[PDB]
């Protein structure tokens, strides 16, 4: 576990105003999702058939270390629940049911149902994550996970059950990366709670 990750997580968690600044962006989304007015940290996906829909956080990170919590109820995932980061150019919708995040060079995602990492996924196969998993093996992840973006080292990592799962992706330095997810489940509600950020030393 990196020393800086321990430093970020030992800090008191950021308050509501900071969480709202880093929440889902009602202006940067598929039209098939909306940000809930009574809980602006959560979006709701309309029950549209044969559609995959995403949304980005309001803040695109270009430097520093950042962590946010995703709460995605396990029975609201369906065939394709993907969590990760994207540039501003990543598409936020596809026809059909797809792992939209990680499907091209503009995003990096963890397909929760397959326990596979995708980046430029049309060209590159998925990577088993967590590491313990065999080639045809997946793990049923709990509702909550932490997403850790290190823009200075250029890495994305995850923490599940308080266990750091290691670097999932590298090569992110010099970009401007937003939290993102892609969803397919009718009426799913996914919450994102920014925890903290830490400037490089």
């Amino acid at each position: 576990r990196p020393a800086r990750l321990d430093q970020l997580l030992d800090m008191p968690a950021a308050g509501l105003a900071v969480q709202l600044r880093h929440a889902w962006n009602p202006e940067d989304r598929s039209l098939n999702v909306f940000v809930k007015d009574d809980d602006r940290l959560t979006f709701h996906r309309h029950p549209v058939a044969q559609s995959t829909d995403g949304i980005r956080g309001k803040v695109g990170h270009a430097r520093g270390l950042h962590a946010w919590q995703i709460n995605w109820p396990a029975r609201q995932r369906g065939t394709h629940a993907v969590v990760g980061v994207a540039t501003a150019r990543a598409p936020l919708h596809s026809v059909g049911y797809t792992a939209l995040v990680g499907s091209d060079a503009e995003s990096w995602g963890w397909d929760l149902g397959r326990s596979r990492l995708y980046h430029d996924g049309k060209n590159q196969p998925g990577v088993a994550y967590p590491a313990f998993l065999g080639p045809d093996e997946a793990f049923a992840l709990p509702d909550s996970l932490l997403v850790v973006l290190d823009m200075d080292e250029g890495t994305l990592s995850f923490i599940v059950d308080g266990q750091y799962l290691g670097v999932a992706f590298r090569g992110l330095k010099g970009k401007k990366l937003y939290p993102v997810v892609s969803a397919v489940w009718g009426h799913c509600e996914v919450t994102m709670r920014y925890i903290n950020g830490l400037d490089p030393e």
Binding site: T79, H80, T98, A99, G113, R114, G121, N123, P125, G126
Partner: peptide, 7 residues
């Protein structure tokens, strides 16, 4: 290599 074994 999608969910339905199609790449």
């Amino acid at each position: 290599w999608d969910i339905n074994n199609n790449x």
